[model samples]
Target: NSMKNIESLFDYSAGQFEFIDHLLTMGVGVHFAALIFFLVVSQFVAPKYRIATALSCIVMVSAGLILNSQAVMWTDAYAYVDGSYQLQDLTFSNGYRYVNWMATIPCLLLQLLIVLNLKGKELFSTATWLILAAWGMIITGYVGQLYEVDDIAQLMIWGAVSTAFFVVMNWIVGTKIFKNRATMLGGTDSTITKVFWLMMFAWTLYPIAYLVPAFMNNADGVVLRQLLFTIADISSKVIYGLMITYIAIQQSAAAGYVPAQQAL
Candidate 1:
């Protein structure tokens, strides 16, 4: 009702409207397809690392569900007025993406804890702290975005709050997972090296997209923001999961898990 569709702020050309629509629909399909990929692949993964695949399943499903809702909201948000699409009273908010992140970020982080093989006290505290820090990042960013329409000041403040949490979370992961150790999974070095750098690159895209409204604040910005999010989604969740799966199955095989080798 009172919820604003930020996408509605600019009248999208018919092409712009269709482009985003198709992109979101594609996102839904990609995530569900990934869900199947994870389930099928996990069968061959060792029970030890299957936890990571289990987590990926949650990420894929939650992302697919939110994206499906996003596509629906996107359609509902617009009405063809004249030739271009205009915002209706009720519209889609990018806010739903925050919900998707909030649900999945902790799971992703926990998967990292498993991949790194932390256990006992280290695992317990790290995960407890991880879930808190991850949620802080999402909720603050979520609040900041809601204010973009009415209060720029609020947006800036909450966005900064979110960034602080983001930096802290990244610091913990960087130090605990990569810096403290020369490598990951005890021995596998190169893959995790690429994973850390690529992982950071992907996760950082969220904040960049979050801030775009401050500067671009129009149709180009909106389309660009969605594009950034889509790229980040694929990078952060889907490809990230693939990287995780590779680490999981490979390590399992090296550790003499027979099914993993058979699958390989």
Candidate 2:
């Protein structure tokens, strides 16, 4: 029996941690990008919409912290069995990832609200449902991850529910909110739509990533899993935020927005 104290064989390699460090660095980069938009650049936007940039930055930072702080390894314990290292008592939970989604996804919807300048009961009602739906999607998946109840099926169900909200949110924006101006806001419209599409497309991959374990049921899949999720994170947050900042700039100009100091 070759069990022979192989604990060292199964431990994470320094290379793995180094890779994770790179991922963490990317996350930090996203946070800084958001901060720049919120604190420095957003001042050029109309004072009224400046708060939107601030809110976006706040949620982006929250996502960065939650996503980066968690270690990428996936085992609570391990055992050497019959010459091979095997995982023991595996408790798969990406709770922080879902929590990050919960925090930022709703804020994404809110960004649309701010840009559109929705108000009255309509704004409140729409925002409430969007946030609730985002929470439902993420928290349900969070529960599935935390508990061992048909994880695949449960995540699929919750994922579909989240997609439902996503669809509705996009519909409202395209039809009710942006309407004819969707293609007519000139380059601003193009930039905003570009970000919206990027966010949605990147978001679609999350459910697929959630379902990856079904296919990639091996240790080797861990790095692939991390890579996919990290890519999605960067696309959804960094690229999307860049587009949002551009849209804010164009929109501010269109509105003849005066900087606060300039107005004074």
Candidate 3:
């Protein structure tokens, strides 16, 4: 039917691409946040559970990504051979739409586990509430893709919310929480954490990379697509390798394993 055809197009809209890219970035960031939070909690949780905590954080976010990707299939998006990927505007179906849904099973199971473990604990704060709001908005916006939008404004709104959340998170880690310090530095003076924080410091330039282009345009008009893509691209791989390197080094030191053998 014509209605069905139009619905498919809506699923592949630019707004939807923004949403997908947003998910990819947030999923990674949330995993990273989990790592940091686990470290903070390791200060309290039993020593036996330190690695367990970090792995749990990583696995939970990975489960979320699997769920989201699986949902993408039946949900009406596709990638084509035209050297392009579209989350909201694919002209065809991938046939594996059903597989995408399977990704949700683990996510749901983990959610139950998380609820069972953290149910009674209370750690409410203004900042925590803001984070929950931002997380809720991101999830809702992505789910809203099952509907329609007149423009990419919905994506833009969520992008701004995500940007704010990233800023707050980075600020807290770099300043108040971590204070540019790492356990690797405390114990063995490993440059691995040095490498990690420095990498984070280096990649922070990215918001500017996207902003410069917007500033070049004008006060009234700007290129939303380029700006969004800039943010999307920069956030994905920027300093990620180094960040992981730092984490690996820290974990190894904690467990009395050797550091990375690769030349850095």
Candidate 4:
């Protein structure tokens, strides 16, 4: 019933929309937590670190654009006869993905500047790991899906390399970065610790959503394929949209504030 139409056009019916609603609710919960976190932790961060937090938020939003562009291309948009798929129902495009890469580069540079400003003292330890993971994820995802190589072996080799980088960076965060870190807020751990755990828990669904179907899928079962595809489709946009809005709102709030120490 969830199959494509006459010319193989994907459609989202009401039931799919309901499932989307559930995902949206989950995302709202994540955003709400992040907001509470912003309020709780804002006072504890060194004045300079606020700028880093805000800039990191910008990096994420920019990189998200790149990720979306890469996703559209990987999903067979180029082969679409009508070109409708080329633009994601006229909302997105494959060619524009690189723009995000360019935009994010400066934000990354600004982040490094922030780190340098920290000198040797670690502030939010999770921030460094987040930056490393964010870059690794963006670079690998782009290279794996882009690049005009046809050799499956090449794809596999590159994918493995990229994935290894991503995994290693993430592990370093869990052990080396977050293990002994404390924060000024609540005399407890940093907000980054809480967010990192929450992100890991949400990310757990990714493997569960795809690994089994990946081994079992064949070309003929189009309906099954579409259903499986919803794992990324139905959830990613909702989660990202919520995340970006929160970042934007928080950045705006922080931009408006000028602590006395900062003015001096």
Candidate 5:
């Protein structure tokens, strides 16, 4: 409904194409490796907190396959024409990346809840609000990214709507998630604190990466965009998964889970 998609107009140099390709390849590898960790690591945590690791495991599997598809899409979108890679008739949209986030965002927020081991009504209501905001954020940004060629009006409309949801998410996290970290986790562990900031950085990076195409719409920008996306994903999902596991183990021990207590 907005301006036409534009990346088809850009042609990538060999190096650029390879870099984007390799970045996605690394994306696949990181998520799969994290999946293995989350899967096996769940055993060390209590049944109560295992759900957090399980949520992380689901995301890692989704991310691994999604990244694989994106890598394939990127390669197939371009054909070797003249001296550079050209996105001829085959159009490569980052639509898969949206799918990746669609699966990711809700679970990421919920993982915090599971790790915090929230009680019934509090857990249910908070999850409903978080899921609503997360999907709102993803869907609005999806619309915004589609108009990236030059439809600034459409893009801005959706972008602002997306940020509105994102702002809501931040408020929810600050109010609901972090506020109890000390009481729930026994104290503010440095690892959880660092990854909390990492979560902020990654979430903040998404708007920038999404904005890159709007500004440049060039092949170089394409590579840069992909790089930012991968960095953000790894920071948030991959590293965040590990840190959540770390927290779960700590809480498992705090809850009098014997194996977790001595596993240190």
Candidate 6:
């Protein structure tokens, strides 16, 4: 009976790991496709915003690469925990994902900053708040995950803090800056506004992703959490980057702004 139970546990763990592998592979594939699409499109962006467009796309590619590498690292580490015969006995650390977010999230915000093109105090203030808020949510989420073993309360508290940062971000983008159609640029009515809503909607998924695993306490849901988070990242970063390209081309045309007649 003892031997049978041990084999059963190993079988269960293997099944879970296989599911995780599938999710990560699919996630990487989607990211790669998005990355390639952005790189090719960057070439045709308006000269004035070409650098910014390229930077945004590069960030997405870097994120996809990092995510793929991290998935590989996870598989390598899986050897240690594979036959543990118990789910909670093995803890999956999200350190890599958080580190990737630390870099990529800021870049996503920078793209928004470029498109908005705020001036003077507003520019500095918006930029500062956006960076701080992005980090706030990411760091808090990391701390929440770290506290998974000792205390779930700490996780919930930090989760609330992260949610607060997200709210601040929405306010900055939705109300504080672009509250009125008149305040937006000429082409923003269609392009920028749509992009803004899409980004905000994508962002809203993240907090839910963080909370689900914490609340469930079921290791079986690990891959589910990863899948949810990965989807959000792809939506917020890659989809947002494409929208930025659209806005750049449209606004440049509207303003008759050409940068040095494509010197490069």
Best by lDDT: 1
lDDT at 227, model 4: 42
Q: Alpha carbon lDDT of residue 75, candidate 3?
A: 39
List candidate 3 stretches off by more than 4 Å: 1-7, 10-137, 140-149, 176-183, 186-264
Where's the lowest-lDDT run of ten residues in candidate 1?
179-188
Going through the candidates in order, what is the number of backbone clashes in each? 0, 0, 6, 0, 0, 0
lDDT of 1 at 137: 85
Error of 2 at 245 (Å): 1.8
**Model 2, global lDDT:** 0.62
Q: Model 1 scores what on Cα lDDT?
A: 0.84
Q: How would you encode candidate 5's per-residue C-alpha lDDT over 128-214 as one tens digit per residue?
A: 998888898999998887778768778888999999999888888777656666667544344556666778888898899888867
**Reference-based lDDT, residue 34, model 4:** 45
Per-residue lDDT over 74-120 for candidate 1, one digit per residue giving the tens place of the 0 to 100 score: 88878889998988757577877888888899888888778777778
Question: Against the true structure, candidate 5 has what lDDT?
Answer: 0.81
Which of the two candidates, 2 or 3, achieves a greater TM-score against the reference? 2
CA lDDT scores, all candidates in order: 0.84, 0.62, 0.37, 0.41, 0.81, 0.67
lDDT of 6 at 190: 62
- After superposing candidate 5, which stretches have Cα over 4 Å from the reference? 1-4, 186-192
lDDT of 3: 0.37
lDDT of 3 by residue, 1-264 (tens): 112222233333444454655645555465456546545544433333233345445444554444345344423545542444333444333112212222322222222122112223321342354345435434543332222223334434544664665565545333422332333332433443344365355435433332332344221112242244334322322233223334444444455443222211
Please tell me which model should have the higher TM-score, number 1 or number 4. 1
Cα error, residue 250 of model 6, in Å, equals: 1.8
Question: What is the lDDT, from 0 to 100, of the residue 145 in candidate 6?
Answer: 65
Clashing pairs in 5: none
* Residue 257, model 6, lDDT: 56
Q: Higher TM-score: candidate 1 or 5? A: 1
TM-score per model over all chains: 0.94, 0.76, 0.37, 0.44, 0.93, 0.80
Q: Which parts of model 2 have CA positions greater than 4 angstroms off?
A: 1-11, 71-93, 147-151, 158-162, 177-186, 258-264
